Design an enzyme around this catalytic site. Structure first.
Site, mmCIF file in Angstrom:
data_model
loop_
_atom_site.group_PDB
_atom_site.id
_atom_site.type_symbol
_atom_site.label_atom_id
_atom_site.label_comp_id
_atom_site.label_asym_id
_atom_site.label_seq_id
_atom_site.Cartn_x
_atom_site.Cartn_y
_atom_site.Cartn_z
ATOM 1 C CG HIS B 41 -0.568 0.184 2.552
ATOM 2 N ND1 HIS B 41 -0.641 -0.862 3.466
ATOM 3 C CD2 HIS B 41 -0.108 1.285 3.190
ATOM 4 C CE1 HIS B 41 -0.196 -0.373 4.617
ATOM 5 N NE2 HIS B 41 0.137 0.922 4.494
ATOM 6 N N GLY B 143 3.438 5.608 10.312
ATOM 7 C CA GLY B 143 4.793 5.197 9.979
ATOM 8 C C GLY B 143 5.221 3.849 10.560
ATOM 9 C CB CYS B 145 2.532 0.578 7.815
ATOM 10 S SG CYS B 145 1.253 1.717 8.490
#
Lengths: 300, 300
Positions: B41, B143, B145
């Site tokens: 993503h 952040g 992820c």
């Protein structure tokens, strides 16, 4: 967002951990530069552990009596000096993995990570608090002695703790890195109680702020109080009293949540007196005093 | 001895963490060998996040569109391929810090450490469980992820998890390293519920063994039960049912404590039905289901 108990990444320290041997006993040591720091009770037998005359016991030890391993590699001890309850062993080699570091003595209520070891090899990491009675609730098996507590600021490692012993009551006492026991404890095998332990008020507050941030809030009430009337109910429930310094420490959190410290106190006081009647707060059914204000910020 | 929640030392992984950039969005990536694994993503705007056509969105990206940093150093992306919900970026350079590793898909109830990051720099480590509804209770800010979960066996790192998203309810969903979501989740911005979560029976048992080991025991009772009569009270209290495999898993613990699994069950059943009336067990006022049998052994 989320909120759980969280330790500093352990790497930087993992490369400072060494095994130290002297006779039968082996334990963990901290290798910074061309010194290796460890608990001095390494030089004891069981006999000696009932009433050790350490000054006596040293001096009668020569350098070659001290084995140090760094992985499958041998440091040569070239000098040895005692500093209170730490042995320090000068070696021929500096640790190429030494990070930027300092030694700090922490204050009760301050937190730190512990990297817990066995035979100079890291087994695991967890986050801890320096209890009011200078004990710590942790996990420490045989061979865990010399496992250190630390904090990281940017990339500076602040060593604050070295483990020495488990007190009957199942909790752990140790020193700073200058070899001074947190608490009234001594490295000998004799039945030592920490006094009754109390809760870290200012931290529990910060926990209630965290809670409110991540969206809980049922425990909030209508009331407010004075810092004095509050304290008078704090002392009753084995809570440390709350200074103005503490209030000041909660100013930022207070400002974010739009909740005045003395209102939070009133909401806490109420919990103390009514319990939690089956409810939970950040999915714990107890008041969590092991997060400092500072911890809560950094996570948030 | 002591018993607390305890994560694997994070070092070995810390040297696999990289920052990955593509347009506005930046996140954490896992650098093993000459591949860098991250959540796909990364290639989305907000527009795209409502309903992303990822296959479409890739291919229209060239390698130079992908920035990778490893400290203050730049890997050059020389190939890029998608594997379900992971992007994998082949680079010109192999990671000299790659440990012995494997990719595993874990099972509900299995635990792991999470090293949680921001901008490819490690901020902190904690221990976690793969909930029955395939969610995890953790801490993950913007952040975060691409932060991974792992276990260490001797010195082999078993990657099991990569973080993708926070579900409304405040908990986190993600993939294994082959890019497959644990749970029925999808990487798009649409309101996704995990189903109702249940407690990890076999773990709570192991917790009660740990307890008894470290010396608690008040909760022990006279009774025993059948595995069936037990289960019939388990299902009522949102506990996962208990297989024979689970019983088998508790055999060693049972053997050490001299307490038969079905007796432990009877003692647990009783707690469920009477609560803990203000008491605690290993100083928690709740039943802890996030320690597996295996975890308890290794610590003990």
């Amino acid at each position: 967002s989320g909120f759980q108990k969280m330790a500093f990444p352990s790497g930087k320290v993992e490369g400072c951990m060494v095994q130290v041997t002297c006779g039968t006993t082996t334990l963990n040591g901290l290798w910074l530069d061309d010194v290796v720091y460890c608990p001095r009770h390494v030089i004891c037998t069981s006999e000696d552990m009932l009433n050790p005359n350490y000054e006596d016991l040293l001096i009668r030890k020569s350098n070659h009596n001290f084995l140090v391993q760094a992985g499958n590699v041998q440091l040569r001890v070239i000098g040895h000096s005692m500093q209170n309850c730490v042995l320090k062993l000068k070696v021929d080699t500096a640790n190429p993995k030494t990070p930027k570091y300092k030694f700090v003595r922490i204050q009760p209520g301050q937190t730190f990570s512990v990297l817990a070891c066995y035979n100079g090899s890291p087994s695991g990491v967890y986050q801890c608090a320096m209890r009011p009675n200078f004990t710590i609730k942790g996990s420490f098996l045989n061979g865990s002695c010399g496992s250190v507590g630390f904090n990281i600021d940017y990339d500076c490692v602040s060593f604050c703790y070295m483990h020495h012993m488990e007190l009957p009551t199942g909790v752990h006492a140790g020193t700073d890195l200058e070899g001074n026991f947190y608490g009234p404890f001594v490295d000998r095998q004799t039945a030592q109680a920490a006094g009754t332990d109390t809760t870290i008020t200012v931290n529990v507050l910060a926990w209630l702020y965290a809670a409110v941030i991540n969206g809980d809030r049922w425990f909030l009430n209508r009331f407010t109080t004075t810092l004095n009337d509050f304290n008078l109910v704090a002392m009753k429930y084995n809570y440390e009293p709350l200074t103005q310094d503490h209030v000041d420490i909660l100013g930022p959190l207070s400002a974010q949540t739009g909740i005045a410290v003395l209102d939070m106190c009133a909401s806490l006081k109420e919990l103390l007196q009514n319990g939690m009647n089956g409810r939970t707060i950040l999915g714990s059914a107890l008041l969590e005093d092991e997060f400092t204000p500072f911890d809560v910020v950094q996570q948030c």
